[PDB]
C-alpha cells in the first residue's frame, strides 16, 4: 500500500470529504486532460499514467458494482471515495504541479494540527494558477 | 445532457389551497434535486435540498418529494408570502447541472459580494468577482448562475474546495472560473448580447459523495452585465 | 485493458485456468521485480509500472473482499473470480522476463492451437519455454 | 514462512488397530495440505490432498481431517500394506511450502524420468533433467523435491504452465528451475555436502486458485547426487 511522490495517506486524510468533487466529476476532469493532454501533447509524465491506473481501477471496481445485480442485501461500499482523493492528488498535481500540491498538503496538514486560537479561522486555500 | 422540465407555466391559486409544482428530469439524478424560491428584486432562496430535506428556514407547510426522475414540490397551507417564482435546480453532475423552467405561483387573499459587472460592447471580455466573507473556500463550492431580464436562472458553473472548476455545456471555454485567496473570479470571453444578465454567485455545500451543484445557499445580490453595440 | 501492449482480451482468455499461478504467488514475483529495477536502477518499463497498477489496485480490491465476511450472513459471495489479475500480473511479469515479443507470439501460438480442432493439432499446446542457456 | 511439525515421530501399532498422525502448521494454510506415503526405497506417493479428498487407489480406511493449522491423518485399522513413513506437505504460497518431519508406521502381523544425477565436487554446479511425458507442460506444474539418505522430504521448487518458477526460502539463490518443450531442468549452484540427496520431480495439479505445490503425483524415481571432494 503506498503513495510516493512525496505524500502519504496521512496527508490526504486531512483534507475534508467536501474538499473533493465526486468520483464521476473527477472522471470528467480527467477526460478533459488525458484526452486533451496525454496524447494531445506527447508528454508521458507519471501523473497521466497514474491517472490511467486509478481511472481504469475504478472501472474494474464499479464492474463489480454492476455485478452485484446478481443478488437482496446490497449495501455496496462507496468508501471507495478514497479514490476521490487519489484522483484529485494527480489531477491537481498535473495542473498546479507536484511542487505546489505537496506544499499545499504540508501547510494544510500543519494548520489542522494547530489549535484554532493560534491559527486563521480558514484553512489555506489552494489558489488557481492564472492565465 | 440534462433537461429539468418544470410544469406548469403558472399556478393561479388562492389562500389556504394546495399548490403542486412538478419537475421531470431527463436522466437519473439520484436524490440530488433542489427547490428554490425567487421573489422579484431579490436573490434566489433555497427552499429544499436533497429533494426532501428542508433548510433552516422553510416552513413545514412546504414539502418536497420524489427521486431519480420525478420530483414534486407541494404547498399545503399557502399564504400570500409564498407567491413567487419557484425553480428546480437538478444536478446529474457538475457539468450536467440544470435549472428548471420556473413556475410563478400567484396567490390572492454568509456574505458574498458580486462586483466588476459593467457595460461592455459585443466581442470583448469581462471579469466578475465574488468576494467571499465568512465562508471556508477550502470546504465549500462557489457556483455562478446568471439570469437574463425576464428570463430564468441559468447555471454557469461551479468551483469546488479543491480549486477545480466545472462549467455547463453552453458556457464551455467562453467562461472560466478562478479561485484566489479571498475571492472567486468568473472570466467571460468573446462577449455576446446573449450574455447580458444578472450574475449571482452562491455557496454550494457538498453532498456526502461530493455533489454541491444542486444545493446553493446563500446567494449574493448579483452584479449586472449589459452588452450592446454603442461605444 | 491490454491493448496498449499489443494483445486483446481474447489472447489471454484462451489460456486454461491452471496455466497461471495464484494471485499471491504473482504478487510475490511482481513485488520482487519492482524490488530490483524501478527500485535502485530506476529507468523502469511500461510493464514495471503497470505491475503496480495490478499490485496496488488488488490491494484496494481484497481491501473490499476482507471487510466482507464481516457483515455467514446470507450471500457472502466474494469475487476471487477476478483472476483478471492472475492473467494481468502474468502478462506484465512474463513480458518483463521473456520480453513483450516472446509473450505476444506465445499467446498467438496458443490461440491458434486452441481453436485448431482436436484432430489436426499437436497433442499438447505450445509451451512457453524459459530463456535459453 | 511455514514449518510443519508432525507428531508422533513414530507409531508402532498392530493389525486391525488404528494409527493416528498429527501435523501442526506455522500459519493457517487453509486446505492446502496433502498426505503422502513413502515406502522404503520407492518414491513417495500421493494419498490425500486438500485435507480431506481421497485420491484414486487409497482405501477408505485412510482418511484425513482438519484445515487451517491442525491437520490429522488417521488409518482406521491398519494392514501390513500400510506400513511406511507418512508425510504432510503443506503450501502457504508456492514459495513457503514444506513437508513434516515424517512419522513411520510400523505394523506387526504420463510419466517422468529424472537424469543427470552423479558425483560432483563441493562448490561445483549441476543440472538435472526431468523428462516429462504424457503431461501438458502448459496446464500442469513440475515441482522439485529432494530427500537426503535416510532423511525426510524437503520441498525445493516448482514451475507452472505460465513458466514462472518458485523456490523455497532455504533454496533461493542457488537452485533455479528452467523449462523446455519436453523437459524441466533444475540447475544447482555451489553444491555443498549438505545437499547430497535423491532429487525427484513430481507433477503438481493446480486447484481453482492455482496452488500446485501441495498435490504432487505422479512421481519420478529420483536420482542420486553425491557431493564429495573425491570428485
Which of D67, D90, D111 terminates a domain? The answer is D111
Residue of D nearest to C81 (CA): D209
- How far is the C-alpha of D75 from the C-alpha of D70, rounded, in Å? 17
CB D164 within 8 A of CB C25: yes
What one-character-per-residue DSSP string does A15-26 give? S-TTSS--HHHH
B206 contacts in A (CB within 8 Å)?
Answer: 17-18
Q: Name the domain boundary from B111, B133, B163.
A: B111
The DSSP bridge partners found for residue D131 are D113, D183
Report the distance separating Cα D151 and Cα D141, nearest Å.
Answer: 25
Cis before C27? omega within 30: no
What lies within 8 Å, CB to CB, of B131 at 6+ separation is: B112, B113, B115, B182, B183
Which of A38, A52, A60, A72 has the most C C-beta neighbours within 10 Å, making it the best mutation to test the interface with C? A60
Q: Report the SS3 class of residue B79.
A: coil
Task: Give CA–CA dist A65/A23, Å, rounded.
Answer: 14
Are C64 and A57 contacting, i.e. CB atoms less than 8 angstroms apart?
Answer: no
- Angle in degrees, CA C105, C107, C110, rounded to 5: 110
Residue C55 in 3-state DSSP?
helix
Q: Does residue D135 share a domain with residue D84?
A: no
Whether B42 and B148 share a structural domain: no
Domain boundaries defined on chain C: 1-133
Distance, CA of C95 to CA of C48 (rounded, Å) = 10
- The answer to whether residues C129 and D180 touch, using CB atoms and an 8 Å cutoff, is yes
B12 shares a domain with B48:
yes
Question: Domain boundary residue among D96, D111, D126?
Answer: D111
Q: What is the DSSP-derived secondary structure letter of residue D15?
A: T
Q: Which residues contact C104 (CB under 8 A, 6 or more apart)?
A: C6, C7, C11, C95
* Same domain flag for D137 and D106: no
Dihedral over Cα of A87, A90, A92, A95: its sign: negative
Contacts of A18 in chain B (CB under 8 A): 139-140, 160-161, 205-206, 210, 212
For residues D99 and D153, what is the distance between their CA atoms, to the nearest angstrom? 6
Contacts of residues D206-209 at CB distance under 8 Å and 24 or more positions apart, as own/partner, are D206/C17, D206/C18, D206/D140, D206/D141, D206/D160, D207/D32, D207/D50, D208/C17, D209/C22, D209/C23, D209/C80
Range of the domain at D13: 1-111
- Number of structural domains (chain D) is 2
Q: How many contacts (CB atoms, under 8 Å) link C and D? A: 86
Residue C67 touches partner A, C-beta closer than 8 Å? yes
Are the C-beta atoms of residues A47 and A87 closer than 8 Å to each other? no
Grid cell digits, residue D188: 544447482
The reply to whether D56 and D20 lie within a common domain is yes
SS3 B28: coil
**Nearest-angstrom CA–CA distance, C42 and A58:** 28
Q: Distance (Å, rounded) from C-alpha B166 to C-alpha D166?
A: 51
Both D88 and D159 in one domain: the answer is: no
Q: Give the Cα separation of D165 and D37 in Å (integer).
A: 26
Residues D163 and D68 in one domain: no
Residue D75 included in any domain: yes
Q: What are residue A73's phi and psi, to 5 degrees?
A: -95, 90
Q: Which residues pair with D13 in a beta bridge?
A: D107
> In this structure, what are the phi and psi dihedrals at residue B49, rounded to the nearest 5 degrees?
-130, 165
Q: How far is CA D191 from CA C76, C86, D32, D171, D199, in A?
A: 50, 35, 31, 11, 14
One-letter-per-residue 3-state SS of A49-112: HHHHHHHHHHHHHHHHHHHHHHCCCCCCCCHHHHHHHHHHHHHHHCCCCHHHHHHHHHHHHHHH
Please tell me if residue A30 touches chain B, with a CB cutoff of 8 Å. Answer: no
Q: How far apart are CA C94 and CA C97, in angstroms?
A: 5
Please tell me the class of the A1-131 domain: mainly alpha
Grid coordinates given for A84: 476521490
Cα–Cα distance, A83 to B8 (Å, whole number): 42
Q: What is the CATH number of domain C1-133?
A: 1.10.4090.10
B13 DSSP 8-state letter: E
Same domain, yes or no: D174 and D187: yes
Same domain, D100 and D130: no
Spatial distance between the Cα atoms of D91 and D98, rounded to a whole number of angstroms: 7
- Buried b / exposed e over D160-169, threshold 16 CB at 10 Å, is bbbbbbbbbe
Q: How far is A99 from chain B (nearest CA, A)?
A: 16
Same domain assignment for residues B154 and B94: no
**In this structure, what DSSP letter does residue C14 have?**
T
Q: Does B8 sit behind a cis peptide bond, omega within 30 degrees of 0 on the bond before it?
A: yes
Resolution to 1 decimal place, in Å: 3.3
Residue D55 CB partners (closer than 8 Å, separation 6+): D46, D47, D48, D49, D217
CA D75 to chain centre: 20
D196 occurs within a structural domain: yes
Cis previous bond, D8, omega within 30:
yes
Point out which residues pair with B38 in neighbouring strands. Answer: B44, B85
- In the numeric block, which cell numbers belong to residue D179? 523449462
Q: Kindly state the cell numbers that stand for D60.
A: 477408505
Q: Edge-to-edge, what's the strand order for the sheet holding D62-66?
A: D5-7, D19-24, D70-75, D62-66
* B89 in the same domain as B77: yes
- Chain D contact set for C127 (CB, 8 A): 137-138, 161, 163, 179-181
Cα D132–chain centre separation: 17
Question: Which chain A residues are within 8 Å of B205, Cβ to Cβ?
Answer: 18
Residue with cell 468568473: B186
Report if residue B230 sits inside a domain: no
A with B: 3 or more CB pairs under 8 Å?
yes
- Does B28 share its domain with B45? yes
The radius of gyration of chain B's CA atoms, rounded to the nearest angstrom, is: 17
- How many helices (H) and strands (E) in chain B? 0, 21
For residue C126, what is the DSSP state?
P
Amino acid at each position: 500500500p503506498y503513495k510516493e511522490f512525496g505524500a502519504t495517506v496521512e496527508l490526504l486524510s486531512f483534507l475534508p470529504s467536501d474538499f473533493f468533487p465526486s468520483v464521476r466529476d473527477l472522471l470528467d476532469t480527467a477526460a478533459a486532460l488525458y484526452r486533451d493532454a496525454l496524447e494531445s501533447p506527447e508528454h508521458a509524465s507519471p501523473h497521466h499514467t497514474a491517472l490511467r491506473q486509478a481511472i481504469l481501477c475504478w472501472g474494474d471496481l464499479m464492474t463489480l458494482a454492476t455485478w452485484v445485480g446478481t443478488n437482496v442485501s446490497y449495501v455496496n461500499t462507496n468508501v471507495g471515495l478514497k479514490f476521490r482523493q487519489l484522483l484529485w492528488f494527480h489531477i491537481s498535481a498535473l495542473t498546479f504541479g507536484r511542487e505546489t500540491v505537496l506544499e499545499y498538503l504540508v501547510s494544510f496538514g500543519v494548520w489542522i494540527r494547530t489549535p484554532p486560537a493560534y491559527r486563521p479561522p480558514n484553512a489555506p486555500i489552494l489558489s488557481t494558477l492564472p492565465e | 445532457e440534462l433537461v429539468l422540465t418544470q410544469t406548469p407555466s403558472s399556478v393561479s391559486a388562492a389562500v389556504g389551497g394546495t399548490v403542486t409544482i412538478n419537475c421531470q428530469a431527463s436522466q437519473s439524478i439520484s436524490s440530488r434535486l433542489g427547490w428554490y424560491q425567487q421573489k422579484p428584486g431579490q436573490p434566489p432562496k433555497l427552499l429544499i435540498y436533497g429533494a426532501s430535506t428542508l433548510t433552516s428556514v422553510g416552513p413545514s407547510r412546504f414539502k418536497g418529494s420524489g427521486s431519480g426522475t420525478e420530483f414534486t414540490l407541494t404547498i399545503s397551507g399557502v399564504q400570500r408570502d409564498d407567491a413567487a417564482t419557484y425553480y428546480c435546480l437538478g444536478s446529474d453532475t457538475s457539468t450536467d447541472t440544470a435549472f428548471g423552467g420556473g413556475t410563478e405561483v400567484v396567490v390572492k387573499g454568509e456574505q458574498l459580494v458580486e462586483s466588476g459587472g459593467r457595460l461592455v460592447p459585443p466581442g470583448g471580455s469581462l471579469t466578475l468577482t465574488c468576494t467571499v466573507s465568512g465562508i471556508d473556500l477550502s470546504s465549500n463550492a462557489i457556483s455562478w448562475v446568471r439570469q437574463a431580464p425576464g428570463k430564468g436562472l441559468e447555471y454557469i458553473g461551479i468551483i469546488y474546495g479543491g480549486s477545480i472548476p466545472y462549467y455547463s455545456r453552453w458556457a464551455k471555454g467562453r467562461f472560466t472560473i478562478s479561485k484566489t485567496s479571498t475571492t472567486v473570479a468568473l472570466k467571460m470571453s468573446t462577449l455576446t448580447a446573449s450574455d447580458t444578465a444578472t450574475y449571482f454567485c452562491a455557496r454550494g455545500k457538498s453532498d456526502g459523495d461530493g455533489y454541491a451543484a444542486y444545493r446553493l445557499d446563500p446567494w449574493g445580490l448579483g452584479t449586472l452585465v449589459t452588452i450592446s453595440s454603442l461605444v
